[PDB]
Amino acid sequence: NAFCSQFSRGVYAIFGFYDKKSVNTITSFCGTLHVSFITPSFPTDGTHPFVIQMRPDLKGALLSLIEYYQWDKFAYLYDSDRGLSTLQAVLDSAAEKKW
Amino acid sequence: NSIQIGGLFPRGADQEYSAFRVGMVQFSTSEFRLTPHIDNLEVANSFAVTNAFCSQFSRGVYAIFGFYDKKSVNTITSFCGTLHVSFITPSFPTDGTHPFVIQMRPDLKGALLSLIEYYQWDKFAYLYDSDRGLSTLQAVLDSAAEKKWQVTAINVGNINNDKKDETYRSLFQDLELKKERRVILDCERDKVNDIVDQVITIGKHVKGYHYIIANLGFTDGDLLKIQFGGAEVSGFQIVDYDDSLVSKFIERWSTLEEKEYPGAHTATIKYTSALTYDAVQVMTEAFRNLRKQRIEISRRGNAGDCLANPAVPWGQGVEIERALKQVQVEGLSGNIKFDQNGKRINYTINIMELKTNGPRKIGYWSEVDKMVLTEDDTSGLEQKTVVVTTILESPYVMMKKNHEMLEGNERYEGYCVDLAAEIAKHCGFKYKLTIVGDGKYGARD
Amino acid sequence: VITIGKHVKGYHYIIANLGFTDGDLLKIQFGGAEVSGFQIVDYDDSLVSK
Numbered sequence: 085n086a087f088c089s090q091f092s093r094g095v096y097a098i099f100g101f102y103d104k105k106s107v108n109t110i111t112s113f114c115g116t117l118h119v120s121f122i123t124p125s126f127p128t129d130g131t132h133p134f135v136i137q138m139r140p141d142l143k144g145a146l147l148s149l150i151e152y153y154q155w156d157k158f159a160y161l162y163d164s165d166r167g168l169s170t171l172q173a174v175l176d177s178a179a180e181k182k183w
Numbered sequence: 184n185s186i187q188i189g190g191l192f193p194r195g196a197d198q199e200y201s202a203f204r205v206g207m208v209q210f211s212t213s214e215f216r217l218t219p220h221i222d223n224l225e226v227a228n229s230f231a232v233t234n235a236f237c238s239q240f241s242r243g244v245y246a247i248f249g250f251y252d253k254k255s256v257n258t259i260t261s262f263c264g265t266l267h268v269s270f271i272t273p274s275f276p277t278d279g280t281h282p283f284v285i286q287m288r289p290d291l292k293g294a295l296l297s298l299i300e301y302y303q304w305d306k307f308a309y310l311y312d313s314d315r316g317l318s319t320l321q322a323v324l325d326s327a328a329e330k331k332w333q334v335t336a337i338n339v340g341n342i343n344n345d346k347k348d349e350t351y352r353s354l355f356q357d358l359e360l361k362k363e364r365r366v367i368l369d370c371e372r373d374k375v376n377d378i379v380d381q382v383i384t385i386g387k388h389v390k391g392y393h394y395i396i397a398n399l400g401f402t403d404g405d406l407l408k409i410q411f412g413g414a415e416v417s418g419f420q421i422v423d424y425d426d427s428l429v430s431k432f433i434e435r436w437s438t439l440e441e442k443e444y445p446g447a448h449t450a451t452i453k454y455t456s457a458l459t460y461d462a463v464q465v466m467t468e469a470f471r472n473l474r475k476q477r478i479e480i481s482r483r484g485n486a487g488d489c490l491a492n493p494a495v496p497w498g499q500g501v502e503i504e505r506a507l508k509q510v511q512v513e514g515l516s517g518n519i520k521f522d523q524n525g526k527r528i529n530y531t532i533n534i535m536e537l538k539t540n541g542p543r544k545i546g547y548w549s550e551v552d553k554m555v556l557t558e559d560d561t562s563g564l565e566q567k568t569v570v571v572t573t574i575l576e577s578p579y580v581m582m583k584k585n586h587e588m589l590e591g592n593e594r595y596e597g598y599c600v601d602l603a604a605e606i607a608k609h610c611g612f613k614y615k616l617t618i619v620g621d622g623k624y625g626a627r628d
Numbered sequence: 629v630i631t632i633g634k635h636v637k638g639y640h641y642i643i644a645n646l647g648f649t650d651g652d653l654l655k656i657q658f659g660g661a662e663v664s665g666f667q668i669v670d671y672d673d674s675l676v677s678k
């Protein structure tokens with residue numbers, strides 16, 4: 085509702101936050117209707133046009149710090165709210181590097 | 184009476200569209216009829232699903248039949264929960280308690296876990312795809328901590344089409360370095376057929392390997408090529424062809440016309456199309472029951488657009504969802520009974536195995552009676568227990584001091600007892616020691 | 629050979645004809661079994677390559 089009401093107003097760009105539930109709604113609407121979306125939320129997995137992510141990635145920083153401390157056995161506690169893309173990185177790297 | 188409903192079908196759902204039309208003709212009654220109003224869309228696009236829902240809300244529908252995906256499950260359950268329109272689907276079950284949504288697919292996570300403790304696995308691999316949600320992966324990872332497993336989970340879904348053969352072969356070589364003999368496949372029918380073909384080419388269907396295909400359709404895929412290889416394959420199925428109600432349907436299904444009904448002239452049906460056929464029965468049974476208790480659901484007032492501020496419910500929709508959940512019939516899947524949330528309860532899943540003759544049946548799974556084997560196997564008569572006779576003389580055969588506590592071969596000790604153990608090892612048999620009854624070595628009267 | 633699983637490591641095959649690469653050879657290539665053979669036509673030769 086709030087996307088289409090501001091689209092009727094004739095706005096140039098939209099600044100907002102999204103969750104894991106509404107990430108698919110934003111990237112589909114802005115891709116079709118060709119409006120830019122600037123967000124400080126978590127980056128989307130894959131590539132989507134017309135979306136500007138302001139938050140840097142973190143998957144490279146974890147795999148460096150774990151390797152620096154030289155860990156082989158640990159426990160990973162996660163919350164599902166930002167997606168499961170971080171868990172999929174540390175499960176695929178675990179099989180390659182024997183964790 | 185004519186009841187007007189809606190339909191949302193994906194691009195290329197040819198067999199499910201055919202089983203929808205066959206279910207219309209057979210479950211038609213002279214008392215009332217159903218109007219389909221079928222639309223076609225891209226299921227992954229949330230924009231296209233939003234236009235399709237608000238269009239059929241403008242015409243005015245009593246219920247909506249459709250499919251969804253992971254990328255659009257949240258669009259469906261939010262619209263149906265707010266605007267009070269019921270939704271019947273054969274897709275994957277949602278996580279939580281969403282109102283106004285009827286799931287026609289049985290759950291799988293309880294059956295998959297119980298099969299693993301039956302084969303008694305401690306270490307295995309798990310290949311998954313991200314399309315149906317990660318609910319099955321989160322089930323086995325949480326259960327691995329409390330019951331002491333070692334699970335290797337690899338994402339196989341995002342492989343590009345052009346570079347398939349390099350990526351699958353690099354994958355199994357990494358599993359070979361870990362000496363992973365046990366693999367679980369959680370993929371759809373097209374993705375399983377691609378992995379199975381890459382298994383054979385590099386030579387991984389030989390004796391010593393085991394595979395579990397974690398979907399409700401076991402025999403829907405190609406199965407002849409791994410049949411003669413030598414590796415055991417287990418799986419699950421909800422459709423029983425030996426049942427008379429299913430076998431009557433297959434006889435009508437094979438004799439249909441290809442040019443009118445595409446995909447009809449086959450010997451088998453998919454589990455997706457079977458639940459599409461059953462859903463027409465559930466929708467017809469509800470409005471037949473709803474007219475029988477004299478409840479009027481006529482809505483002469485116009486709906487308007489879906490984007491109404493404030494959004495208003497219509498109280499006849501509360502009556503309809505209670506009628507849909509209170510439906511108990513018999514179908515191709517089996518007994519169809521619903522709980523309060525709308526998920527199927529009181530169902531059976533058939534555990535199957537692949538043999539050189541073909542797929543067989545070794546039991547079933549139910550939520551009250553966890554795993555029940557089917558006693559159709561007689562074995563053990565091939566092995567012989569050789570009867571060894573002896574006499575009690577020291578130090579050849581002697582009774583141990585705790586002979587009351589022990590039983591059988593453990594009771595005796597001596598020279599001949601150790602000699603009997605050595606000969607059975609070199610010859611390769613099993614034995615049972617018996618004292619001679621007469622107590623004499625041997626003579627002839 | 630492939631269907632019953634006899635192209636794995638530990639097996640050897642000799643194809644006794646003058647045409648080795650004329651038949652289909654990609655399917656036993658990645659398996660693991662050694663295959664030997666004979667050929668009289670040399671594609672590296674300039675007269676053949678012309």
Ligand SMILES: *[C@@H]1O[C@H](CO)[C@@H](O)[C@H](O)[C@H]1NC(C)=O
Nearest residue numbers: 511518520528529530531549
């Ligand atoms: C399911 O319930 C019905 C009665 O409501 C019963 O006849 C049937 O046997 C039940 N299913 C199983 C597998 O016991």
